[PDB]
Amino acid sequence: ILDITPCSFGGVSVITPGTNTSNQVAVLYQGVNCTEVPVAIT
């Protein structure tokens, strides 16, 4: 017997200073343990 689990997914929030301040951004993968974001290395 195999368990089936839907493979990791979640909200993506993009965090920015204003465009008038910078084009650099940070990104939050909501409720994701980011061992799995490197496993996804658009």
Binding site: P6, F9, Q30
Partner: protein
């Protein structure tokens, strides 16, 4: 003072991983953006409260 902040992925709920469902869901217009905007509005307000 507050309640749990639900966020729903309207496409994962309706169509979960099916792209041929997702193309049909686009025919319904902005309703998933409305549903997510509404829940995001509630979620931000739980911190304000």
């Amino acid at each position: 003072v507050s309640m749990t902040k639900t966020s729903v992925d309207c496409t994962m709920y309706i169509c979960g991983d099916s792209t041929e469902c997702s193309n049909l869901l686009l025919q319904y217009g902005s309703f998933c953006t409305q549903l997510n905007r509404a829940l995001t509005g509630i979620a931000v307000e739980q911190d304000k409260n």
